[PDB]
Symmetry: C3
Subunit: 138 residues, 3 copies
């Protein structure tokens, strides 16, 4: 499907918004003030729950300006389709300054990543030979 169902748990929540015509993601808004400490982390409230479309999960991904200006990086970020709790935004602050967040600030984005969510695990003896082979971390 294409339907993203959103539950607003309080008057402090904001419906996520699409910031441009073919934006990858939807802006997620803080529903409560919080400070993320320098070289530290915290969890931003949203007061929202959602059910992403079948064939996706909801990825909480960085708002680009916050990364550059404030050293902010999203942590965790995988929202499962069966999750009905409040979605929380985990933020790492890699800068030397505490970062102030106010209720209604855009703190991250939600991307409806398409995935294979019905895969069959098959245990095998070996994998198909490739030119890459075992080469990694080059």
């Amino acid at each position: 499907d294409k339907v993203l169902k959103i539950q607003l748990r309080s008057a402090s929540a904001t419906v996520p918004t699409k910031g441009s015509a073919t934006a990858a993601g939807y802006d997620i808004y803080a529903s409560q003030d919080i400070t993320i400490p320098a070289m530290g982390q915290g969890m931003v409230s949203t007061d929202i729950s959602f059910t992403v479309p079948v064939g996706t999960y909801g990825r909480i991904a960085p708002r680009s300006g916050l990364a550059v200006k404030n050293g902010i990086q999203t942590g965790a970020g995988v929202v499962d389709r069966d999750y009905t709790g409040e979605v929380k935004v985990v933020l790492f602050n890699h800068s030397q300054r505490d970062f102030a967040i106010k209720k209604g600030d855009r703190v991250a984005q939600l991307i409806l990543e398409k995935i294979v969510d019905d895969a069959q695990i098959v245990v095998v003896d070996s994998l198909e030979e490739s030119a890459r082979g075992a080469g990694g971390f080059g």
Copy 2:
């Protein structure tokens, strides 16, 4: 819709889905290791796998370890043609060392669907959009 998993030793665990319609498969450490505070490390899995056509394997974070322990996955892109042992790269952004024991779930594998057969083509200019050059706002 087939994920082929190779178990390379007795210390490997087949990855597992943590709920009915979980996005990801939990990945298990095959070794004990410490991820130093404000540092990083690499966790063995003793597994290899081949992701389905049109996907790559993203090594994504477990949510509890991020909140409780400051753990974040690094690197994280497993190509479909990789046949080596898959490694979990971990950053510890906390002030506390993080101990991992053999058999702990240290990350999750997500089969991210991608366009892996694009034609890359050089153009003089892109389609004009409302967004334009607007970035990092």
Copy 3:
């Protein structure tokens, strides 16, 4: 409709390239020298713009080798299909070693992540009950 269009904004830019026959990503090249300081961050110029295919966004993802050998993690990372500015690579350096970048170095990789870009947002009083429910961060 599987075409990735790349605009080279200068002689210093390099068209991104696949590093193996079925690599997930296209390596992104620095167009200008820069140093990412130990326990710090920076922005890498590419002098490229691109329009990703319909149904995707461009994710600027980390190169594996730089993560383990240099402590490098990409920040931000979400390039919208309608972006026509210069694409910039945000790098965090989590190591104690300044990371020296030279024009022509591979600095990140571009992954054409498939997403639902035409979802309909529907606000509901409650989500469908699941066995997971509000269970998160377990």
